[PDB]
Amino acid sequence: CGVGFIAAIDGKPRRSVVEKGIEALKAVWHRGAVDADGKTGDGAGIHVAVPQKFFKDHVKVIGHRAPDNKLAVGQVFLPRI
Amino acid sequence: CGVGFIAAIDGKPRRSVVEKGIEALKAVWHRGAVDADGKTGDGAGIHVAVPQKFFKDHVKVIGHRAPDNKLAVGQVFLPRISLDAQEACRCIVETEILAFGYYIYGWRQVPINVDIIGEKANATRPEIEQIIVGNNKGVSDEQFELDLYIIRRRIEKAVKGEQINDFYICSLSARSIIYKGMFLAEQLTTFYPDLLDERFESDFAIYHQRYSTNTFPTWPLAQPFRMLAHNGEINTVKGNVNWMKAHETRMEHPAFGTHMQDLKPVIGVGLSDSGSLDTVFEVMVRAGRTAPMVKMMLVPQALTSSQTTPDNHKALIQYCNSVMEPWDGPAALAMTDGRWVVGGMDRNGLRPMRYTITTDGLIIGGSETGMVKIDETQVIEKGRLGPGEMIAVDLQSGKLYRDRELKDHLATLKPWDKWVQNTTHLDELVKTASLKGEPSDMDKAELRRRQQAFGLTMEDMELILHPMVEDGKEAIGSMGDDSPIAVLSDKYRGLHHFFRQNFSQVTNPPIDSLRERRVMSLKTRLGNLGNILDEDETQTRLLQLESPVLTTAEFRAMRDYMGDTAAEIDATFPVDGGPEALRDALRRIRQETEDAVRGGATHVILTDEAMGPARAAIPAILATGAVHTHLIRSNLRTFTSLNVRTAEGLDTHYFAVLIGVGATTVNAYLAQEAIAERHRRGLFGSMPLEKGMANYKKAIDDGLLKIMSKMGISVISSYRGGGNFEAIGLSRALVAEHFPAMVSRISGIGLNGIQKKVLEQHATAYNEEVVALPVGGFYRFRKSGDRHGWEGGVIHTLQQAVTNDSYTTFKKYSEQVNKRPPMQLRDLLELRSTKAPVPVDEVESITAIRKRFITPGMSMGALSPEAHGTLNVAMNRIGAKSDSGEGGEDPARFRPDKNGDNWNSAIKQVASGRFGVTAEYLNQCRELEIKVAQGAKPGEGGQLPGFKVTEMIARLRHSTPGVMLISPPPHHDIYSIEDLAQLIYDLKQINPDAKVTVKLVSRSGIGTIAAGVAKANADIILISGNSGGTGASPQTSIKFAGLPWEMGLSEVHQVLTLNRLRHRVRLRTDGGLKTGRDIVIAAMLGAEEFGIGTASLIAMGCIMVRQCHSNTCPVGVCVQDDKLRQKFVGTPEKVVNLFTFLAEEVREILAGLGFRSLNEVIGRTDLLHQVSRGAEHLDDLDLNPRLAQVDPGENARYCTLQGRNEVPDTLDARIVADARPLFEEGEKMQLAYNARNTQRAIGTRLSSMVTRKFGMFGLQPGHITIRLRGTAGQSLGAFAVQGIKLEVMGDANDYVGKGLSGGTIVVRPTTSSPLETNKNTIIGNTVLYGATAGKLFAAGQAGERFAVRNSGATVVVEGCGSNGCEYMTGGTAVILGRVGDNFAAGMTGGMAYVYDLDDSLPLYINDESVIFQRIEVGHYESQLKHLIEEHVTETQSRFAAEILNDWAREVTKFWQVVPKEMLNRLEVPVHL
Ligand SMILES: Cc1cc2nc3c(=O)[nH]c(=O)nc-3n(C[C@H](O)[C@H](O)[C@H](O)COP(=O)(O)O)c2cc1C
Ligand code: F3S
Known about the structure:
part of a larger assembly, 2 chains, mainly alpha, about 25% helix, binds flavin mononucleotide, binds FE3-S4 cluster, NADP (chain B)
């Protein structure tokens, strides 16, 4: 178990932010619940800023025209059965 | 699968009832689906009476005082994971029960045993408990039950309000209890040991087991429900739910009271068809009616216009049909009110139900007639249940009512005769309306400008409109649809092209509208809706129409009858409205209609006659959909009607969609105007305008009936407003906002695209000077019309590449065919991998890929014998498999020629007509095939013109030369999934080496059907598309039926991989495959084998003439005459080179991607992307639904098993182990055994052994004889050959003598039975289905559809049922008893003799294609005499012996039925 955050003071979006976030997540296993099957966790999550360039390049590859303002994305969990 | 009931006639409880119920459940395991686990089931249930002494002793043990009145017990399913939701549920139940004043005695945990349930069904097992509630207020029993029902409903609502999952109430009543679960049928008394008690005694019991189509068990979905038990499926649930939502807003009864407000949403969410039907049944029963009356009102009889029914029953049926919409579909029901116990059937009678009366006052009914053992010296009468029949038991009075007595007892409560007279008709009003007020026909210029505004070309009036008025039947096409889809088109396609129709796969049978037409009604009622819980005369005072479509005069007359109570609404929007004019117009009209219906108006007419050069017309479909949905959501549709005036209706598919959307009547005036304008120019000849209009209306009605019958709906009232279509190319939001219940897997255009299209067409039509209608290309290729898949240059270069044998021009062909703009859904996909390319020489060889291509089946009636033989030789040369299609095949081609070329076929088909199936035809193949529906005409049987059946095809199909042959749409063998499993078992028993293939048609929901068929031990699935070829079929079924094969392929693959079943079956596709790119894409979607079809026809000489139905094809591919067959130039080398180049190309593609085998690509959907057509079309097609990638887990993505799926062995195994001298020395054998209903297909493997050893006619009759004592199973003696003689003592279940091929079957009661042989049923339904030779002598009455599709068999029975001797072709049938309605329907050959003593044949026979007369020739007397003598000798009957005794006076009681086409072909004429 554990909570943490990383912030750039000036306001640079940069890769080292996500680098250090993932590195921090990779160093918490000692507090978590040690389990037998080795695969079932108890819940984990990360929260970051939306990479406009990624989704804009994706939409371009689809064939649309990338807008100028900020694009929005939503993540959904739908039924599976 | 199976439902049944047991009842004590006098009504005294006894343990034997529950004991026999358990015993009956213990003997149904053979119909269900076995599993490798051995513990996993799909649902079982029993329903009995409350053992008052048991719970009273329980209460005594606890320490309380035993009450006097009857106690109440409720059974509940609570959640099991959390321990807090249980407390909330208990608190809710206790605060709701104590709110009425009853006293709670306590809870009880039911003792169970979880050791026998499987692993998957144990993950969702709820916590089962019981609550004991007593009655202290001294209130009567009926008020007690009413209060319990109200309490249960309010509990359900309150628990729903808090969003608690896994909560159910199996039953809450002081009369009955229900034990149901997700275990095996035989393990019921082990899971619930309570039933093993000596104190559970009752006077009635119901038992049920089901057959699920998936592998996800939900405990609250097991049957029986509260006060119902259903077997089958209901076809009309999407329409009945909406009409329930409309009937809810006016129903109320003084019995409930204020609590009525707590009962409004009668049908909740998360129920099956039977669940909703049960809820409606219960809410209607609790209001005062009885079980027989509710059964009559929900699933009524077929109101036949015959004199075989008294008029009281007719008034009753009229009332019940007028008050409520029927719930059609295959349904065998066993329901039970608190007092009555009823068992009944549906309208058509598709499922079987047989009962038995014992001397102990015990009635036992079920699906099979041998489930409960009963000494034959203790029965009184055996019977059956026909269509619409019912049998009831009154427990309070202790009486038993059969059909007629119950009808006469029910027709005495209310005087319906004086009530039905309140109705009025329209024909009388049209007659009294004198011919005045004829309005002037519009101008020719006006007519042309109005027709151009909708895009009507001239071929739409020269090709598809001329036949309707000239003859009365639609046109006929002879090739598949190779035109682009509506959204991908660039011309003006009407909105009605986006909607594809529906049909019924193995889950439901289609209905034959040509022969079984007596059960189809097109009545319409205006002013019909009302309170469904009242009894008065105001419920039958209304206006009645005989058809939904109307002419101009009838519409005007109806308008004058309506008067000032009707309100007309414009349906036009300004051309100068702007970018959002259509949405504003829709809102305007949907508000005006709501404001008008509130102001007293009872009739809404949606007109658009104001269309001019300044106002564009709203597409009628959109308008009526919006209005109907807005009236439904506003609780107003129950008050008014909805009449539509359109200026587009020309075809039969328009009115179908308009009625399915919700319109009541539809008026098309532009069509009549164009008809009059074409008649006044002298084009129809000497026929008046009135006769042309009558023929046009008749054609429209027949087309509507045909479109309605592809699904199984027989009444228009339940089909209206159900949304029985699928939208392709329309946005999800639009169809979810405007249309009741339709699915659109891929989004499409919104309202802006539609507005652009309509404005463009309106401007083109009204802003320019039009001189004539364009030629237009939609059914034939034109340079100005639409584009086609098969153009001229493409066929030319393909024939060149195939003939000259050079790969370069084949590459040019592929380039030219994949350079065109997008036309199909597989054009928007883009192949993109991530690896490094590899050389082309190292991928798998061509033979290893050519061995994966198959040619589909093409009947010998459609194709010419030369082309079929050429294909069969060409496909057997490289190692691939061919297909013979329906219509049989030449037996002489069963051997290789001297040249080494084998004309045989590797895949034989089993169609619905069974035109050439025998015991030798099914032993000459490596893989069988079950054709459920064809890719071109889904939900219909193949056609063949009357001149295409030459003498060769006549002797090959065992048919009459020069008669049109139309196979029945259903199979009469596949009425449900367990029937399909039985048929697969039979096919796997008759051929011990072959595999069984099921062919399906792409549509929505095919995933569940494919998951269900995989459990039926099939191993090859074939998903066809909507663009497949055909021989002869209507144009509407070609253009407006089916879906692209991508949907079906992707959906079936995903569903199979989701249920851990993909590793058991193979997948195969066809339809529109031309190149190697399509093959790579299809293999990437999940297929493993591929079909080509029409391309091979082009490699042999086809030039896309589309005139195969006319027998005048120029090249000589699909012909039957000689002088054009001589022009044939086909060559097998052409097909070989085509397949070779096709494999070369896919090798090139695989090399370019980076893989080395097709096995590395199957299922890898992640290698596909969607590319847009640009930023100028603005079509929002989203293909992610077909790009979803489910992960298999451990198992592979394809079939990883060798050989077919094996099946258990029946009795025949022992026979093969005993009759060894028969095969080793060839001597006579006489065997005796005991038969049971758990042993299917007795005498089938032995038939295969005999056929392989000696042949079909190699042995003298009676060489090996077998004697069975006891009720035999299903499909007794199927596909028996000459030399085998089975003799049953007892009775047979069903499908007896199916596909007989020379054997001999004899069924008779046991020697010590006290039964009149000619008054009891002894065999089931579908006897001698598709037989070709043999004999059969029964000593009882047959079931329904007796002697269907007979070709050469001889049968003598002492009775028959409904629809008997249907579509017979040859043989002789003697019937010593009564027959049912519609006898001898569609008979085109043979002869029949009926022994009529009540002089009632002229009322039951179907005098359309046959003639019935008296015997007048001694030659035809000797035949009957010898047949009856042989019957007496074989079965030792006493009735037939009596008839043979008094022959002189009994010869004068026989009617002879002879077909009409066989009056001048017999050798001895029937006349003098
Ligand atoms: C001339 C012709 C006759 C056909 N006859 C039958 C038939 O008798 N039974 C059947 O199930 N399908 C029949 N079909 C349909 C094919 O089995 C297959 O579904 C179709 O040819 C696939 O279309 P495609 O060539 O465009 O891939 C026939 C097709 C054609 C063109
Ligand atoms: S389209 Fe048909 S009619 Fe002959 S030329 Fe081709 S097979």
